Amino acid sequence: TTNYIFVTGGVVSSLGKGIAAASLAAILEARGLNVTIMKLDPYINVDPGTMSPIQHGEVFVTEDGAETDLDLGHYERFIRTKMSRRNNFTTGRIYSDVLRKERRGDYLGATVQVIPHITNAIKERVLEGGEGHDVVLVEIGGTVGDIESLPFLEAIRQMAVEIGREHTLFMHLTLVPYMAASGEVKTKPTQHSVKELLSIGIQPDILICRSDRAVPANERAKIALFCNVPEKAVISLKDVDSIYKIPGLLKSQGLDDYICKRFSLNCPEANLSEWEQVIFEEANPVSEVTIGMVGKYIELPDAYKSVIEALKHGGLKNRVSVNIKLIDSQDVETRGVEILKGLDAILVPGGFGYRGVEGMITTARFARENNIPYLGICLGMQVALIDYARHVANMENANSTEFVPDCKYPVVALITEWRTMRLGAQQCQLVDDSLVRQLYNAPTIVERHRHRYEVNNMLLKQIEDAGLRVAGRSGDDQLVEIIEVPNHPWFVACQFHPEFTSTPRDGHPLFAGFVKAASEFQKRQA
Amino acid sequence: TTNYIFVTGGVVSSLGKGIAAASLAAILEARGLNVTIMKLDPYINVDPGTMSPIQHGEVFVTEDGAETDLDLGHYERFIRTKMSRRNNFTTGRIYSDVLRKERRGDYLGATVQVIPHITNAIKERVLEGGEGHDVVLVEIGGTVGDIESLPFLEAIRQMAVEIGREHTLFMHLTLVPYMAASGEVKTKPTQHSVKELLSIGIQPDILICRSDRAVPANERAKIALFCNVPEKAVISLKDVDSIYKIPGLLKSQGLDDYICKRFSLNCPEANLSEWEQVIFEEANPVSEVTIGMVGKYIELPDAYKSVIEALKHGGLKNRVSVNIKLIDSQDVETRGVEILKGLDAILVPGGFGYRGVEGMITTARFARENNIPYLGICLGMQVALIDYARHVANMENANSTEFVPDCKYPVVALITEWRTMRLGAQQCQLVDDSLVRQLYNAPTIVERHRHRYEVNNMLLKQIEDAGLRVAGRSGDDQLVEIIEVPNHPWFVACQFHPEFTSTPRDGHPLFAGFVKAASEFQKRQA
Amino acid sequence: TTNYIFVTGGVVSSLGKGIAAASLAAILEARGLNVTIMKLDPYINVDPGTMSPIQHGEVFVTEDGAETDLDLGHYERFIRTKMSRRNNFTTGRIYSDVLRKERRGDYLGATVQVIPHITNAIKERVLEGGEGHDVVLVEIGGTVGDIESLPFLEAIRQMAVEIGREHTLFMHLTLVPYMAASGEVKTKPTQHSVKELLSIGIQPDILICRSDRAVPANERAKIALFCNVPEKAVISLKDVDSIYKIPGLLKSQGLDDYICKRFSLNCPEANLSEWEQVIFEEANPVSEVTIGMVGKYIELPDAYKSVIEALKHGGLKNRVSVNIKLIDSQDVETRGVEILKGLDAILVPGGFGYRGVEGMITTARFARENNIPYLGICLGMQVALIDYARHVANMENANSTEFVPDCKYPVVALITEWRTMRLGAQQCQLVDDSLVRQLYNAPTIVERHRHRYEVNNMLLKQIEDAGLRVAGRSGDDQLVEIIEVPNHPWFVACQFHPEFTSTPRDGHPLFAGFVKAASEFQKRQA
Ligand SMILES: Nc1ccn([C@@H]2O[C@H](COP(=O)(O)OP(=O)(O)OP(=O)(O)O)[C@@H](O)[C@H]2O)c(=O)n1
Ligand SMILES: Nc1ccn([C@@H]2O[C@H](COP(=O)(O)OP(=O)(O)OP(=O)(O)O)[C@@H](O)[C@H]2O)c(=O)n1
Ligand SMILES: Nc1ccn([C@@H]2O[C@H](COP(=O)(O)OP(=O)(O)OP(=O)(O)O)[C@@H](O)[C@H]2O)c(=O)n1
Ligand SMILES: *CC(=O)CC[C@H](N)C(=O)O
Ligand SMILES: *CC(=O)CC[C@H](N)C(=O)O
Ligand SMILES: *CC(=O)CC[C@H](N)C(=O)O
Ligand SMILES: Nc1ncnc2[nH]cnc12
Ligand SMILES: Nc1ncnc2[nH]cnc12
Ligand SMILES: Nc1ncnc2[nH]cnc12
Ligand SMILES: [Mg+2]
Ligand SMILES: [Mg+2]
Ligand SMILES: [Mg+2]
């Protein structure tokens, strides 16, 4: 039978709900259980594809081609269950489905109301997502006490009643502020948040308290007294330097044992050896390289969360501390190549639009002509090819049909325009003589795509003759996926997204090689 | 171990909470359990002795001398557990106790707050009241969602947590209104009341729905869905003609079985034979007499609730329907003796003050001179003696020192003034030649007193010579308790309160004889 | 006509409500208005005399002898209106008054309820406190959303309706937390607190936001949007180093102009010259002395708030930075005189009990024998006299009858025991040849007392012969109030409390002289 844990937040948002849910799922997975996580967003957007990177952050791509939130990236980094479209949906999706059915006439002339019909749709989606697992962690976005999240809370309360309270738990996150005047930690906001959740109709079973420091025992006893929660179920989660210590903290406080007691599960003791290994590797670097990431969404760092974490994972595998410096593309466009000095390696991540693309072309030129290690992802691969064709093959302002519709040299164009967006995991074939073959150590690889424009095969032969090699191709139309500069210490560009598959316990060959190249370059340049 | 049921009300007051609690206790007592009931009043009055009859109703006197509410009269009528001071207390009592302790210094210089100290006092009183019983029914006055009753609800929530939820139940009463426009019963007020109770921090276990008619099954299913309560625990209690059918209704709906399942009690099936006997006796009268009750608090009928019910009980024992007509004393004072015509018997209950006493004297005169059966209780006994002394013994305006401090003939006076209030049960000795001896059929009786002024023994010998007999006396000072007119079909006056001991299953000899005399008088006067 | 401002707090307590109310009253007083402040405490204690210093802090003594809270000390430091018993009362006081009246029978047999009677008592007290002033600031203790403060809020809502909304304002204090994760300030707790206050029935007119930093304009616009408050009435009050800058900040944000617009008051522009003078004096010290305060309540610094502020005020008058070091008396008792080294002056404040008194005697001995400046207040004066009598006059363990009832040498005793607590302001006569005469520069002074035991006049002549001089006496019994050591640079002890009369704009002669003596001692000892 399937057990459900519902995770909600109070007082303020931005408490770190996804990280805590991922850590708890990691602990449960370490005990041999089959767990999954699903995210509920109170957004009217049907999917985050329309959303821009400088509002919520990077868009995560699943194996099957769904576009989701950064939370699913967190979950895939923490557990070994592959996410899909069933692990994330919004309010807009539910309303669209119900409106479609009502227009089609599926409700047989009945009045379509919120409490029966909207909450029925929500419950159906939650059950279909959780089917086939031992434990399901359902995280509810928004703060408890807001108009936007009331249908979700009502649905989960009804679901808890229908399923049974011996298979459902409720977990509430709160903020315990610290006041420097009295020098104490205040428990009143938690009390009022529990009161609001009770007014909705849900009794918390576990209270997770978020604070700068650890919550004292007397404060936890007070919380237990005022919130109908047992004293053992008031769990403290202080701020940490590394998110990889959070499973250890929650395990030491006994959250896993309490959850297993309530759900009547007889699972062996948790083995957190891999997480301890990750902590040990992180705590003991032997070097320090600086990587320059040049992109257009520098203002909001969450636009590159997966890429930053993948660089960190590669550093962990190479036992090297990685220092990411963010460089704005328009700065390179106007100020020049001065900013790019003092960098052991350069990374150009993906993006949409023409703003800052010229700066990216300048950056690729500088890296290629200065033998600085370079990694290009999606848009970076395109700008690298454009720079190589223009300034090494003399294509006289070759560009992409994305930016200039008519430039007489469409090196990058839609597959139709060789003179719909590719989504999901695709298979790619690696050439035996290239760097990526020795990096992956496999004949073929599988990676995820979120692009529209491709590399023009008609103009590809000339650029190949100029010296640029192709390291990977698709399955049917032999679309170019990986390119490489031969006369370079390390110069790899890829059409797909490798950051959506790196994990702190396994890493990724591409980023490990990139960081190793950066370390070797700094040792050479010292 | 002791189990606790906490009974609260919502939407509106005056739902009949005490009757429902008494009926449930009756059902539990019919299964062989040791139950008790306690009442919590949100009043600032320390005790109802200061309160006037035309605000809340008659004052109930326990065996030990406590003054309480009408609810304790209900409870003593429904169960066979004697009440005391431990079964009723107010907010004012708790605050007085805590203020006394704080002034005395018992709190050792700590700050006396509401949540720790007031609720600790409340919990201590509740535990001391409930000690030594199988089940304790704690009824909380006021509506849920009011300022006045928040300390009580907080205290009972904390008590439920401390004691354990396998020994505590919460029962909520609500109003299900009926709207004649749509012709339906509305469940929304119940939903909002349950939400308010949850906001306080209590989850109901049982919902009792009050309505003119029975609540339909679909409405109950809706209530169960919206209130986290199982569908079997939504109990309908419609308006009834007789409060004696309520235990049968609650038993038929399965409330007792659910309560016994939750508390893990193995008690035999309920035997409600006596209540069925009472219903059968009530439903089948053979006669119809009319009794005139003359008093000063006629405006509020709750000022004579116990006396009215005792007359009804006597009628049930005599298989006679009793029709109580209320006559205002000042009406007799001004309009005259015209109102008292067409009455088979006359009752004068107790009271305080001089307003209307002359009308009572007129009424006693009329009854004595017309051979109409007469019953006098406390003040009625005094006015009967005054009338007999004045208009048969020629005492020339003899009165009580209560009304006129100096009248030269103090037939009624304080024990000091023979030329502090007696409270509780006292023993009395019956004379062998009198009516009350054959009525009680016992050498001695025990009854309850709530009076200050007594009968003057110095002037008693003359009135005894005039013809009036004394039927009962006290133990030490031979205070007169019962008097009788010999040349009358039925003329009994008592100093105590016999209505505080009549029950529908046992009755009372005095009221049974009074009603029988009324029936005989009507048969004679045909 | 009298205008009322009601000040409440939300989210958490300890926001600094009294300081903000005092600053606003200071601004209004700077515009020529007649203002007063009153404090409402949700305590069951009738008065803080029973409370101990290590729970809430020092007890404030008014001119008329009332014992109050530290808030009244704040108010007297900020405005020039003398407080009294009418400026502070608790829940326990209101309940005691109502219980007394109900027992006495003043309510004529009616039921005494919370909403009519308790709130009527509260309103009567508030009106009697505010009568005769232009503006009244009523501060309500407790957080909005607690059981303990609901009667106060209901009373003030009813009062606002009765008086009129053109003479009543509501001011709400909230916490705007800062989250280091996102690096933003969160407005959600303020939104929920305003919702709770609205649920009680009060619409805020002004929102005062408390935070580490200043609240940004966009956040304030959001607060205005969500809370029905105009954008100009959302006032930011960040944490400050000096509480004397708070009136300037509130004045710069336009709170005074808004309040005067709402109340239709035409008062001249605020003149905050004196507060600017205080800030200038504080910001520019020329020296740095360290003062050792030795006492028994060192654990809670609020037990000496007035004394600490008075030392700071004296330093401001002497343009000297004052560094207060707290020394525990039992430390001196056990560890010895080692702790008292490196101190330019020593202060012994008052207290009750024998614990630590021996350490105080040791400290007085050390100061007297080392010519370190010494100030003694109440208990300190007693221990100084005990030390002088024992170790200079050889009284062989002379003590107070407070500690040892029978010691054969009662230098300190009750006025009866020469072989009830003095409260309020009393007049004292200064001797012309003493230090205090040149300090006060007046024949007589008026100060406040909170003591029981006095100096024995019978044994006083011997100690006077030994060398100790008496500098002040009472009016009728010539009770000793001030003593002095002649062969000392500065050694003054007083029976009264001079810290209850020092203000940052006027200071106090005694503490100014004490701090000047400390500076001279350090210059000598350098
Ligand atoms: N549900 C509650 C809980 C507390 N109190 C009252 O609130 C006061 C406590 O002050 P406060 O410090 O604000 O409460 P804490 O529980 O200590 O909250 P915090 O942890 O933030 O300090 C006490 O007098 C108590 O009677 C109340 O009225 N209602
Ligand atoms: N907690 C709830 C429950 C009901 N609904 C909505 O309220 C409407 C139902 O109307 P109403 O008759 O007032 O609700 P009932 O449950 O039928 O209440 P009642 O028994 O009084 O008729 C439905 O559209 C439903 O979506 C809601 O918004 N919130
Ligand atoms: N009364 C309100 C106000 C806000 N929202 C929703 O809450 C979300 C905003 O998230 P949050 O940051 O928590 O709200 P803020 O107003 O920005 O609160 P804060 O200042 O603490 O960040 C929005 O989607 C909005 O639709 C809501 O449902 N009910
Ligand atoms: C994948 C990405 O960053 C988009 C690049 C470009 N706009 C495209 O191919 O769609
Ligand atoms: C018992 C009663 O009705 C009071 C009667 C008279 N006032 C008395 O004796 O106190
Ligand atoms: C005023 C003070 O500190 C008390 C000192 C001593 N106990 C007394 O006189 O009461
Ligand atoms: N304990 C924690 N410390 C830091 N960031 C967090 N995000 C979620 N939980 C966290
Ligand atoms: N069901 C009911 N009918 C009439 N009066 C009542 N008082 C309490 N319950 C009642
Ligand atoms: N703004 C403020 N800074 C510091 N302490 C305070 N107490 C009250 N208001 C304050
Ligand atoms: Mg506290
Ligand atoms: Mg309906
Ligand atoms: Mg926000």
Residue numbers in the entry:
A (entry chain B), B (entry chain C), C (entry chain A): 2 to 420, 438 to 544
What does the paper behind this entry write?
Utilizing cryo‐EM and single particle analysis, we resolved the structure of purified ecCTPS bounded with CTP, NADH, and DON, achieving a resolution of 2.9 Å. The results of the two‐dimensional (2D) classification provided a clear visualization of the ecCTPS filament, wherein it assembles into filaments with CTPS tetramers as the helical unit. In our obtained structure, DON forms a covalent bond with C379, a residue that is critical for the catalytic function of ecCTPS. Upon the conjunction of DON, the GAT domain adopts a closed conformation, preventing external NH4 + from accessing the ammonia tunnel through the catalytic pocket of GAT for further utilization by the AL domain. Through computational analysis, we observed the presence of a solvent‐accessible channel on the side of F353 close to the AL domain, connecting an internal cavity within the GAT domain. The existence of this entrance to the ammonia tunnel explains the feasibility of ecCTPS utilizing NH4 + as a substrate when DON is bound to the GAT pocket. In our structure of ecCTPS, CTP binding was observed in the UTP binding pocket, consistent with previously resolved ecCTPS–CTP complexes 18 , 21. At the 1σ counter level, the adenine portion of NADH displayed clear and distinct density, while the remaining portion lacked stable density.
Cytidine triphosphate synthase (CTPS) plays a critical role in catalyzing the final and rate‐limiting step of de novo cytidine triphosphate (CTP) synthesis. CTPS is composed of a glutamine amidotransferase (GAT) domain and a kinase‐like ammonia ligase (AL) domain 1 , 2 . Filaments of CTPS have been confirmed and characterized in multiple species and conditions, where ecCTPS has been shown to form large‐scale inhibitory filaments in the presence of product CTP 20 .
